[PDB]
């Protein structure tokens, strides 16, 4: 029972590692996206965007 | 949040008119005096079916 506890916690421990980068890697490329898009001029200010 | 062809500024006021005018197109030869009696603003355009 004790290596079955310990073979739960650390596939339990691997889901959280795997979740926590993607989220970390989804969050930074989240941020850049909305920085390098956002507000463009409209058409009477200028021609181009 | 809006989007707007031209600042709505516009369609709502207008511009107090100064200065002097040119020649004229026949008789005594003068310039008119200008004042805030002119508007400069957007016109009306009617339109049929």
């Not at chain 2, 709505?8 to 100064?18: I, K, Q, R, T, V």
């Amino acid at each position: 029972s004790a290596i079955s506890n310990v073979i739960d916690w650390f596939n339990s421990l691997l889901n959280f590692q795997d979740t926590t980068t993607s989220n970390q890697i989804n969050q930074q490329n989240f941020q850049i996206a909305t920085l390098a898009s956002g507000i463009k001029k409209q058409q009477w200010e200028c021609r181009y965007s | 949040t809006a989007f707007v062809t031209f600042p709505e500024m516009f369609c709502d006021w207008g511009f107090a008119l100064g200065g002097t005018t040119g020649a004229q197109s026949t008789g005594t030869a003068h310039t008119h005096t200008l004042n805030t009696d002119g508007l400069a603003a957007l016109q009306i355009q009617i339109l049929p079916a």
